[PDB]
């Protein structure tokens, strides 16, 4: 992440330290999409109802 503002001449730059992150099952999920969608395509199976 870098913070850039209009400096004296034309621009000014103030950066920050980089960081890394990975997304796995250990990462908590808020979902918020809920469920009840027809036709499921997942790692588990292919079930139709």
């Amino acid at each position: 992440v870098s913070s850039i503002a209009w400096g004296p001449n034309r621009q000014d730059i103030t950066e920050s330290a980089p960081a890394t992150f990975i997304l796995n099952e250990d990462t908590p999920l808020d979902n918020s999409f809920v469920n009840e969608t027809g036709i499921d395509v997942n790692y588990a199976f292919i079930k139709g109802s």
Binding site: W6, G7, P8, N9, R10
Partner: protein, 49 residues
């Protein structure tokens, strides 16, 4: 004894310039070139609109 009368101050050249600031445009400043003799001068402007 020889002398000379004062010169009436007249407007020779006049213009207004605004300094270009990085963030926006600076306030314009009117630059006027004048010649004549006067203890002090009063300058007034009337809008032509």
């Amino acid at each position: 004894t020889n002398f000379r009368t004062k010169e009436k101050p007249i407007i020779v050249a006049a213009r207004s310039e605004s300094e270009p600031v990085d963030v926006g445009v600076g306030a314009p400043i009117v630059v006027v070139e004048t010649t004549g003799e006067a203890s002090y001068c009063t300058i007034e402007l009337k809008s032509t609109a």
